[PDB]
Design a protein around this ligand. Structure first.
Ligand code: HEM
Ligand code: CNL
Length: 397
């Protein structure tokens, strides 16, 4: 038998711990012999699991197009995913408009706002001694940051989460499309308001931008709105939820981050390696051979980053969280021309989130009377992480 034959990122076997990591480890073992395999799922597609094979695919933009970045395709109506769903020269043209606001220098400026936000959020339940770390904290830190980036009201997270759920998980196609159409309606309204009253946020920036002397179409602006929403509300939230779950039970990891705060940045990169939630697809546009496998135009290759990030030929002791690991050339944020636009921002965000969480609540554990839940998909991670902790005090009454 082979684990590739029915591999499906939306239907990964979960182990007794509640994660797909036993399955991922078994697939990684198989990938040492067969780094690329055919899956019968989604009508047939290639699963790319080896580190060097993923790198070969991701670097070869001539044969592998980002038109297949989401597979099955996200529900975004007739709109394509801005930057992520495009090839050069179109892709580069748009990324250039937002490179600066996402640079390390610029994103470092969010640090104190995030620190304050994390503490204000913790205040909401610290006196209760219990809460769902995903719903209460991991979801809300990036939701509020995303609202700030987009110039939206930070308190409307539930609305934003409902849009993103429709894009990424709603089964019924008509329901999904209708809810994405609600996002579009809200985006158009936002865009019109900012045309006359622009702020300092990223939507205002692109709305006032030009390419070769021309303003962006409303459709292109809706694309920008949608991709930034996804990175925050889906990718970041699921990553942080998985991290908080791990910290809840792994008392050895936890004590080391508290004793050595200087290691938190390196530990965040190791946690990205280990709990990085994303996979991406590529559409094959010309016949190409990778390793032993020849792929044909029209086929899709899924890049199983979590498996490659556990490849023994790329990482010593890959199944262990080695917080002092360096270098750490993991693929959780991609590589090459499409490498995560939000990479520096989310590294800052994670550092702060972990730091303040462990400062405020050094002692906690998983709730024995409530269930954790892992969400499978193209972005996969914990969705519910009930924890308990000694009742504490608010910083701000
Ligand atoms: C832990 C959180 C996140 C993870 C793990 C993640 C992961 C990734 C990955 C793997 C890619 C590569 C896409 C590919 O190769 O096709 C990517 C691209 C991208 N991400 Fe992130 N992402 C995260 C958060 C964010 C955030 C917060 C934002 C924006 C505020 C964002 C915006 C983007 C954009 C625009 C691209 C496309 C870049 C391009 O095509 O040049 N992401 N992300
Ligand atoms: C999964 C991944 C990497 O996240 C977004 C934000 C970028 C590319 C794809 C789809 C949406």
């Amino acid at each position: 038998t082979s684990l590739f034959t029915t591999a499906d990122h939306y239907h990964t076997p979960l182990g007794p711990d509640g994660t797909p990591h036993a399955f991922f480890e078994a697939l990684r073992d198989e990938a040492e012999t067969t780094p690329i395999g055919w899956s019968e799922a989604y009508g047939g597609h290639w699963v790319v699991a080896g580190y060097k094979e993923i790198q070969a695919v991701i670097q070869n933009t001539k044969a592998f197009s980002n038109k297949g970045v989401t597979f099955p395709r996200y529900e975004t109506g007739e709109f394509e995913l801005m930057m992520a769903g495009q090839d050069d020269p179109v892709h580069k043209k748009y990324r250039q408009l937002v490179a600066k606001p996402f640079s390390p220098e610029a994103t470092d400026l969010f640090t104190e706002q995030l620190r304050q936000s994390t503490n204000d959020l913790i205040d909401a339940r610290i006196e209760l001694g219990e809460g769902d770390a995903a719903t209460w904290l991991a979801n809300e830190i990036p939701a509020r940051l995303t609202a700030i980036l987009l110039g939206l009201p930070p308190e409307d997270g539930d609305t934003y989460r409902r849009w993103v759920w429709a894009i990424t998980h709603v089964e019924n196609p008509e329901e999904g499309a209708e809810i994405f159409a609600e996002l579009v309606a809200h985006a158009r309204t936002l865009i019109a308001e900012r045309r006359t009253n622009p702020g300092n946020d990223i939507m205002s920036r692109v709305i006032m931008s030009k390419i070769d002397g021309e303003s962006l179409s409303e459709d292109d602006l809706i694309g920008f709105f949608t991709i930034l929403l996804l990175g925050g509300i889906d990718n970041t939230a699921r990553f942080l939820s998985s991290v908080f779950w791990r910290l809840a039970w792994d008392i050895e990891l936890r004590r080391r981050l508290i004793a050595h705060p200087e290691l938190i940045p390196n530990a965040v990169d190791e946690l990205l390696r280990f709990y990085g939630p994303a996979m991406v697809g590529r559409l094959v546009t010309q016949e190409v051979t990778v390793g032993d496998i020849t792929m044909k135009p029209g086929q899709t290759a899924m890049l199983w980053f979590p498996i490659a990030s556990r490849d023994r030929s790329a990482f010593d002791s890959p199944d262990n969280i080695v917080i002092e690991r360096t270098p750490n050339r993991h693929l959780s944020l991609g590589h090459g021309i499409h490498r995560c636009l939000g990479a520096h921002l989310i590294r800052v965000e994670a550092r702060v989130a972990i730091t303040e969480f462990l400062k405020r609540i050094p002692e906690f554990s998983l709730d024995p009377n409530k269930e954790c839940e892992w969400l499978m998909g193209q972005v996969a991670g914990m969705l519910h992480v009930p924890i308990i902790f000694p009742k504490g005090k608010r910083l701000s009454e």
